[PDB]
């Protein structure tokens, strides 16, 4: 959603 | 069931022509085109002027559910509402943490934008297939490319010199004005030459392919060709290395208080007009880092994406397509002669193009330009469907 | 040791010499589509920038 990809 | 609390796009079961197709996919493109900065190349949040949520929910809405599964239109009906629901939950989460980076108004505005974009994902994907964020990168890059002619006159401030009127054509102000000034403040000539040159070189390298002869199994006489593209992966290595670049530099920014100042110079993309050489241990070795990175990413993507030699041979067997002279099992070896080394060399060459664009200092720091050309070619490949 | 790296190198030369490089005639038409798309969509980008120009002031 925080950073590439959370 | 629990997916009954959301709507979904209508199913295309009729002929879907080009005109109305661009009327659907290429219209209402102004919503995100209204008006941790290393992620704005892929998530153009910026100051959140109604563009702060793209791609981050688009793929995650389904992929997070698929990942947590380890923790057909029927499956589509099963997952359709729920994937959007969880995408909007994570969208709200991203919005609130971005606020961290009373304020409910901005969060709900970001939620509205994300709602529109997610609901539009399926609308664009049906047919042409511009969803999954494939258009967002080119959309945010194309302005950075073309809006030099607006940045040059709109900059009312002039600093020490005078540039309020413009820089593209302002020779009459002194002519005599000399264009051979410093190429670090407004280098229009060098930037344009570099941009067009990198476009040209990537186009030239883009048509590289290997034509393997193929014959249909039952129609003895129908000859055909099968293309193996030189890159064979398009943007995957560049995307992954951009992701690593982000995960390095945004983490450095996070940890600073806890790249071009107050931080180590162990790793950095060397940028300087012309060139600068003071310590070769970083200026050149950056090239090795980029090349090895891209090659590794392409090589692992081959196995991840299911495009290895044996998988392609299995697909061809499924399609009844065979080679003329080789047994149905030896086709794997013929493919294997090219596919793995083709992927590795595609990674190496695309990294080399990236470092060349960095050296010439084209628009967008080289990266993205390669995304730009590949996305345009993807659009062309999709348009090929209308002619076949 | 390094010999397999040189084997990879000669593999790369063989692949390139086997690859079908574009000629001028088809380059002139393939790059045309890229230029057309580039222009047609950078135009929309410039237009939305122009529309942002007054809303600020």
Author numbering:
A (entry chain E): 1 to 6
B (entry chain A): 11 to 45, 61 to 96, 104 to 133, 146 to 219, 228 to 310, 336 to 465
C (entry chain B): 7 to 63
What's the publication's text?
We solubilized sheep ER microsomes that were pretreated with 10 µM KZR-8445, isolated the ER-bound 80S polysomes, converted them to 80S monosomes by RNAse treatment and subjected them to gravity-flow size exclusion chromatography. We collected a dataset consisting of 30,266 micrographs and carried out single-particle structure determination. This resulted in a consensus reconstruction with an overall resolution of 3.2 Å and local resolution in the Sec61 region of 2.6–7.0 Å, with poorest density in the N-terminal half of the channel. In addition to contacting the lateral gate where signal peptides ultimately insert into the lipid bilayer, KZR-8445 directly contacts the Sec61 plug helix and thereby prevents the Sec61 channel from opening toward the ER lumen. Strikingly, Sec61 TM2 and the prolactin signal peptide overlap substantially with the KZR-8445 binding site. This analysis indicates that KZR-8445 and the prolactin signal peptide directly compete for binding to a functionally critical site within the Sec61 lateral gate. Nevertheless, the bulky bromobenzyl-Trp R-5 side chain in our cryo-EM model of KZR-8445 projects into the Sec61 cytosolic vestibule and would likely block many signal peptides from accessing this site.
Biogenesis of most membrane and secreted proteins requires the Sec61 translocon, an evolutionarily conserved transmembrane channel complex that facilitates translocation and membrane integration of nascent polypeptides. A defining feature of Sec61 clients is the presence of an N-terminal signal peptide or TM helix, which is required for cotranslational ER targeting and insertion. Hence, a primary mechanism by which signal peptides promote the opening of the Sec61 channel is through dynamic hydrophobic interactions with residues of the lateral gate helices TM2 and TM7.
